Design a protein around this ligand. Structure first.
Ligand SMILES: *[C@@H]1O[C@H](CO[C@H]2O[C@@H](C)[C@@H](O)[C@@H](O)[C@@H]2O)[C@@H](O[C@@H]2O[C@H](CO)[C@@H](O[C@@H]3O[C@H](CO[C@H]4O[C@H](CO)[C@@H](O)[C@H](O)[C@@H]4O)[C@@H](O)[C@H](O[C@H]4O[C@H](CO)[C@@H](O)[C@H](O)[C@@H]4O)[C@@H]3O)[C@H](O)[C@H]2NC(C)=O)[C@H](O)[C@H]1NC(C)=O
Ligand SMILES: *[C@@H]1O[C@H](CO)[C@@H](O[C@@H]2O[C@H](CO)[C@@H](O)[C@H](O)[C@H]2NC(C)=O)[C@H](O)[C@H]1NC(C)=O
Lengths: 80, 407
């Protein structure tokens, strides 16, 4: 995984190697469970990762963060 | 002379005193025009095509989606936006997703969500405007002079036409000239038709049908794709994501729909030339300027011989190749009589006034013998050539119409 600061947003750039992994981001954490994700290519996807409350269980999302604001996940579906 | 090489043939007969005749030229057919004291004229429709038709539209049937962006906002916090929405090369969709506790929203309800994707057209179908006036058609013309088959292609004058091209002259050295006023008649109305192109394949399609296609289309000269959403699939949204997928290649569907359409042959050499099928050309031919060479020539009196024996053409006519070793320049005397005694010509001479300008010339002569038993007689005296012939009375491939007089 690579995490980059782009303007107001913080970009979670993940691969198939990051499947289900949780990462410590600053004072909070972030998690992605995206089977679709493989390696980067123009056939990509980028969207928001909801900032959840301490006891907020994920609902209808495959990417989320606890205590981290303005994070978007991005991934590719191509093989290296 | 080339009509002999062509299976479907028709004979136009001119009435003595007339100057014009009317002929209908279909593709893959030939027409032999005969007038008294005039050399017979083979005319045939080679190709009917359109050259450089302006491209009206392009219709993408295979699209490729790249770089999908999705933005969202919790209920009652405003609409969600993307910069790609302003980008013309992007197909976008605005909708709403169920939000609340579980996806980081303090309110339960419909939250804004938008998806954008970079649209690239992998494969598109071209649609050309067919101009009635820019329609071109080519006609081969040739005379019956006595040329060997091996020479036909060099004696054939090629007449190029378009709509309102004016009359075209066909000038034959030593035999004058014939004039053709042609009008092209197409099978298809082009006021409501496009020329559709997919890969190497081409068709004639209806304009209204093509415009009504639920597919992304691009204007002439291009640069903008309209109605991209026809090849883009947005699945029902989740809280913060939407699965956006490019639709399947619509090549198959398009071809399927195109099975019920007339087809067009794209020219092999030129990428802009489109040859039409089934069209015909109505021609008016002036013959009064045609003349016969060797009218002053004395008749051949020397011993001639058959290079090629009289043979059926499949048109109910007979061709022979006669060698003239001595006597040239001279007229070759040819009749088709009832017997060896009579001297009345019952046959019809396609090669009007056959001549041998030089010695050892081999003159190809075509003649239409009468039905039943007859004798083909070339030359006179004891050295003359005779060949017994019989015409079956069975149906031949050649068509004969009523002789015509036009002032
Ligand atoms: C990513 O971050 C998630 C969010 O964690 C938040 O919480 C704080 C503590 C920090 O971790 C911040 O990063 C963040 O804002 C993690 O999910 C959460 O993890 C925490 C820690 O394990 C869970 O908290 C625990 O909840 C237990 C609930 O059981 C009891 O709860 C009620 C009261 O609510 C009790 O009355 C009942 O008896 C229930 O049995 C609770 O038992 C725990 O308390 C004990 O532990 C804490 C700290 O260890 C200690 O201070 C306390 O005195 C006790 O000893 C604790 O409160 C939380 O439930 C959980 N939430 C969800 C939605 O999963 C996530 O694990 C993390 N990911 C990784 C990989 O680390
Ligand atoms: C996510 O990470 C990939 C992998 O690094 C990024 O792709 C890189 O882009 C650079 C140009 O900026 C190129 O050298 C290659 O395409 C990639 N480099 C390497 C080393 O793999 C991709 O741009 C990232 N996604 C986003 C949205 O930033």
């Amino acid at each position: 995984v690579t995490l980059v600061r782009k303007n107001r947003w913080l970009l979670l750039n993940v691969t198939s190697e990051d499947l289900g992994k949780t990462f410590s981001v600053g004072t909070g954490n972030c998690t992605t469970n995206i089977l679709e994700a493989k390696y980067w290519c123009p056939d990509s996807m980028e969207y928001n990762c909801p900032n959840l409350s301490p006891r907020e269980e994920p609902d209808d999302i495959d990417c989320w963060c606890y205590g981290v604001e303005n994070v978007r996940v991005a991934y590719g579906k191509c093989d290296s | 002379a080339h009509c002999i090489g062509i299976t479907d043939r028709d004979f136009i007969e001119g009435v003595h005193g007339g100057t014009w005749v009317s002929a209908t030229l279909e593709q893959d057919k030939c027409v032999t025009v005969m007038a008294p004291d005039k050399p017979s004229l083979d005319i045939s429709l080679e190709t009917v095509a359109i050259d450089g038709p302006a491209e009206a539209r392009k219709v993408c049937y295979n699209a490729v989606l790249t770089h999908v962006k999705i933005n969202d906002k919790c209920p009652s916090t405003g609409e969600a936006h993307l910069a790609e929405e302003n980008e013309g090369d992007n197909a976008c969709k605005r909708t709403y997703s169920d939000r609340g506790w579980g996806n980081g929203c303090g309110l339960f309800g419909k939250g804004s969500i938008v998806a954008c994707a970079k649209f690239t057209c992998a494969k598109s179908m071209s649609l050309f405007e067919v101009d009635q006036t820019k329609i071109q058609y080519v006609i081969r013309a040739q005379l019956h002079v006595g040329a060997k088959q091996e020479n036909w292609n060099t004696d054939i004058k090629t007449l190029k036409f378009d709509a309102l091209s004016g009359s075209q002259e066909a000038e034959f050295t030593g035999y004058g000239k014939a004039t053709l006023e042609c009008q092209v008649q197409t099978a298809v109305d082009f006021g409501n038709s496009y020329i559709a192109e997919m890969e190497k394949e081409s068709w004639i399609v209806d304009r209204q049908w093509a415009q009504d296609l639920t597919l992304p289309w691009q204007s002439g000269s291009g640069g903008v794709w309209r109605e991209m959403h026809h090849l883009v699939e947005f699945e029902p949204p989740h809280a913060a994501t939407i699965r956006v997928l490019a639709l399947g290649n619509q090549e198959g569907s398009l071809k399927t729909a195109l099975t019920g359409a007339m087809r067009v042959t794209k020219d092999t050499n030129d990428n802009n030339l489109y040859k039409l099928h089934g069209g015909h050309v109505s021609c008016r031919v002036k013959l009064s300027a045609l003349t016969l060479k060797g009218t002053s020539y004395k008749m051949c009196t020397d011993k001639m011989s058959f290079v090629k024996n009289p043979t059926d053409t499949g048109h109910g006519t007979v061709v022979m190749q006669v060698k003239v070793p001595k006597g040239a320049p001279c007229k070759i005397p040819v009749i088709v009589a009832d017997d060896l005694t009579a001297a009345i010509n019952k046959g019809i001479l396609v090669t009007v006034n056959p001549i041998a300008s030089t010695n050892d010339d081999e003159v190809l002569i075509e003649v239409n013998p009468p039905f039943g038993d007859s004798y083909i007689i070339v030359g006179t005296g004891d050295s003359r050539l005779t060949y017994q012939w019989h015409k079956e009375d069975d149906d031949d491939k050649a068509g004969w119409s009523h002789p015509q007089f036009e002032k």
